[PDB]
Amino acid sequence: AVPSVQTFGKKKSATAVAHVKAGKGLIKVNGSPITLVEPEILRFKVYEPLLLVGLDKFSNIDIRVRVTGGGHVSQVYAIRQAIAKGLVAYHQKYVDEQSKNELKKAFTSYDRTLLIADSRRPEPKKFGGKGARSRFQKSYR
């Protein structure tokens, strides 16, 4: 029985589970270090939860995240949400509220999407057009 917690996260259809146990500071996604994203532009977008509050709270935890589904940005949004919820979960089974409550206040003070998932989902396509609102080109004469 070694200390550990688990979380989840979605952006549009992806899933990302962070088994944040007690470690020496290892942040890995699909077996690769956190510094290897893929868009190489949203690398600081997934670096977010690392840098809002500081790296000192990250020195006694190891976040292992597995992601499935969605586009490359959707995977990135899944990773950042999972690690952000993973950080609070580690603070939601061991550490005090002052550590957690200002952790969980500051995360949403910058952006609500770190903990709260995006509620918007794709809408079903309706007959008569290529999309839901869109319709085929109608003409007269």
């Binding site: 956190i34 510094t35 532009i41 840098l51 790296l55």
Partner: protein, 206 residues
């Protein structure tokens, strides 16, 4: 400094990014003030961001689009012209590349250059349809501060996009030249010339 190295190491530059707020990793959001009091509270520069790629809930109501970073609005408005629909990963790449040229040439803070450019190319007076009943007829009216920012961003984006049409210069330098020239209020800017046309038309039909 804080030299904390975890089990998975992170470069010291990223560790440096935790000192100040996001900062686009090289460019101060602070010390950047909108000169015109008219466009205050509508050009969002106080809230910082690592990247200009966020899934904000901005179009649901009327005025949350004002609570959007001005840099992000530039990336959104650079995403036009048909085939270039989506591809937001590209749009921030020119923005990063264009924003760099604003630092290499005309060495001030590029964020400051962006905000003063949009405040100097936003039309203050505009004409409207009033044809009522009788072929046509114009009539001059005023422009809201929100519309001033929206028109300013649109003019800058279309000007650089058109000037990059069938030309060796890439959109990165074309955006940089358009913003720099509009920043210092020179006549060669497409946006500045367009602002002159709308203001003169409104002035004539006053």
């Amino acid at each position: 400094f804080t030299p904390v190295v975890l089990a998975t190491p992170i470069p010291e530059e990223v560790q440096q990014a935790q000192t100040e707020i996001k900062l686009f990793n090289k460019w101060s959001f602070e010390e950047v003030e909108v000169k015109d009091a008219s466009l205050v509270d509508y050009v969002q520069v106080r809230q910082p961001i690592f990247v200009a790629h966020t899934a904000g809930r901005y179009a649901n109501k009327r005025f949350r689009k004002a609570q959007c970073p001005i840099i992000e609005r530039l990336t959104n408005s650079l995403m036009m012209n048909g085939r270039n629909n989506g591809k937001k990963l590209k749009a921030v790449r020119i923005i990063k590349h264009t924003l760099d040229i604003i630092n290499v040439l005309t060495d001030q803070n590029p964020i400051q250059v962006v905000v003063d450019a949009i405040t100097n190319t936003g039309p203050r007076e505009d004409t409207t349809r009033v044809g009522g009943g009788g072929a046509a007829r114009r009539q001059a009216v005023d422009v809201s501060p929100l519309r001033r920012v929206n028109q300013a961003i649109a003019l800058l984006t279309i000007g650089a996009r058109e000037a990059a049409f069938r030309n060796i210069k890439t959109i990165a330098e074309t955006l940089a030249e358009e913003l720099i020239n509009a920043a210092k209020g020179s006549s060669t800017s497409y946006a500045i010339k367009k602002k002159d046309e709308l203001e003169r038309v409104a002035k004539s039909n006053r």
